[PDB]
Write a protein that binds this ligand. Structure first.
Ligand SMILES: O=S1C(c2ccc(O)cc2Cl)=CC=C1c1ccc(O)cc1Cl
Ligand SMILES: O=S1C(c2ccc(O)cc2Cl)=CC=C1c1ccc(O)cc1Cl
Lengths: 9, 217, 231, 9
C-alpha cells in the first residue's frame, strides 16, 4: 500500500 | 481544532496549503504518457495538501485512505478546471501543456465537460477562496458514505463559503442561490470523475504503481 | 412558470407526484435472473409515469423537445433511485422497491456487484432519515436532479432559463426551512447538506449504468430502458 | 425512439 506510506511521511 | 476556526482563518489555512502548479516534460501514446506522469507527481502534493486540510488529520488512517481514493480524480479535475479558467476553450493541464479540443482526439467527451465546467466558473466569476472551499468539500464528501465528525467540518466549510459571499456584498437570496449553484457543479465533477475512471481502467489494463493503486479501488 | 409563489411551487410538485407501483413478485417462489427481471420491469413501468411527471415540473415544459429528451436520458436512474431512497426512508436496513418488493442487504448479494450499489442506496436512505427529510424538500430535490444532471452538456439562453428555475427552487427550499423554525445558519447548512446528497446519487447512477451495460451484452430488458442505456 | 413519443401526448 503506497498510499499508506505517503500519508505517514 | 478544525471546528474552532473563524471562517477567516479557515480561508487562510486552505489558501496556505494550496499545492503548486507543476510542469510537464502528439500521438495517443505520448500524450497519455505526459498526462499520467503529471497526474502522478500531482498525487504526491495532494496527499500533503490533504493532511493540511483542517479536520482531515483527525481521521483514521484508513479513513484518510478511502477519502483520497474516492476523490483523487475529482480533486485533479477541479484544479485543472480552475487553472484553465481564464483560458477559454483551453484546458491548462500545465503552464507548458495547454491543449485544445482538437488535441482531445489524440477523451473528447470528458474534454468538453471539463471545458464546460471551466466556462461555468468564469460565468459565475468563481473566486479562489471559494475554490479551495469547494476542493475541500470534495475531499470530505465524496467518500463519507463508504462520520459525525465529517459532517461537522462540512457544515463549517458551508459557513465559510456563506461568509465569503457575505463579505462581497450579496444579499441573503444571492448567497444561498450561488451556494446552490456551486454545490450542484460538484455533481458534474463527480460525473466527470466516474467517466474518467472507466476510461483509465480500459485504456491502461505504462502507469505508475501509485496511480495504479488508486485505480484498483 | 417563473412567477409562482414558493407555496404554489410545492403544491404543483406535490400534485405532480407519480404513483407508487407494484411488481409481479410472488413469494411462493424465489433466482438472480428472476429478481433482475422484476427490478427491470418495475423500472420500465415507472419511466412512463416519470416522463409525465417531468412534463409537470415548472420550467420543463418551456424547453425544446430535444433538451427534454436529453435531461431525462441523463437523469432517469437518478430520479428512480432518489424515489426508492425516499420510499425506504422509514424501513431501516431494507429497500422498498415496491409495497410488495421489500429487500434487505442479504438479497442484494444474489446479484453480483449490486451490493455496493445496494449499501450505498441504504446509506442514502439512512441519511434522509437522520436528517428527517420532508416531502416538500424531496419533491424539490427530485426536480433539481431533472434540471441539473444534464444541463452542462446543454442553445444557450434556454440554459439561462434553466438556471433561473433552479434558483427559484433553491429559494423554495430556503422558504420551507425558514418556516420550520431554523436559523439562517441552519438553513444554509441543511441546504448544503441536501445538495451534497445529489453528488452521491449521481455516483450511484453512474455505477448503475456500468452494471446495466454489463448484463445487456451478457443477456442475463425493455425497449424504452434499452434506449436510455444506448445514450 | 420511445422517449420521443411519450413526451408529446
Ligand atoms: O484528465 S486526465 C489527467 C489529469 C492530469 C493532471 C491534472 O491536473 C488533471 C487531470 Cl484531470 C490524467 C489522465 C486523464 C484522462 C486521460 C484520458 C482520458 O480518456 C480520460 C482521462 Cl480522465
Ligand atoms: O436499483 S435498480 C437496478 C439495478 C435496475 C432498476 C432499479 C430501480 C427500480 C425501481 C426503482 O424505483 C429504483 C431503482 Cl434504483
Amino acid at each position: 500500500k503506497i498510499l499508506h506510506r505517503l500519508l505517514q511521511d | 481544532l478544525a471546528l474552532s476556526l473563524t471562517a477567516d482563518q479557515m480561508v487562510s489555512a486552505l489558501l496556505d496549503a494550496e499545492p503548486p502548479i507543476l510542469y510537464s516534460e502528439f500521438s495517443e501514446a505520448s500524450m497519455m504518457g505526459l498526462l499520467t506522469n503529471l497526474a502522478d507527481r500531482e498525487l504526491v502534493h495532494m496527499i500533503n495538501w490533504a493532511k493540511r486540510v483542517p479536520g482531515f488529520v483527525d481521521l483514521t488512517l484508513h479513513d484518510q485512505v478511502h477519502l483520497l481514493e474516492c476523490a483523487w480524480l475529482e480533486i485533479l479535475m477541479i484544479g485543472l478546471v480552475w487553472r484553465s479558467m481564464e483560458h477559454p476553450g483551453k484546458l491548462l493541464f500545465a503552464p507548458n501543456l495547454l491543449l485544445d479540443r482538437n488535441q482531445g482526439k489524440c477523451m473528447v467527451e470528458i474534454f468538453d465537460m471539463l471545458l464546460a465546467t471551466s466556462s461555468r466558473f468564469r460565468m459565475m466569476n468563481l473566486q479562489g477562496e471559494e475554490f479551495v472551499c469547494l476542493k475541500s468539500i470534495i475531499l470530505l464528501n465524496s467518500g463519507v458514505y463508504t462520520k459525525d465528525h465529517i459532517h461537522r467540518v462540512l457544515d463549517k466549510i458551508t459557513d465559510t463559503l456563506i461568509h465569503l459571499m457575505a463579505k462581497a456584498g450579496l444579499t441573503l437570496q444571492q448567497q444561498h442561490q450561488r451556494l446552490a449553484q456551486l454545490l450542484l457543479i460538484l455533481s458534474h465533477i463527480r460525473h466527470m470523475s466516474n467517466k474518467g475512471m472507466e476510461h483509465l481502467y480500459s485504456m491502461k489494463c505504462p502507469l505508475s504503481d501509485l496511480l495504479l493503486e488508486m485505480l484498483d479501488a
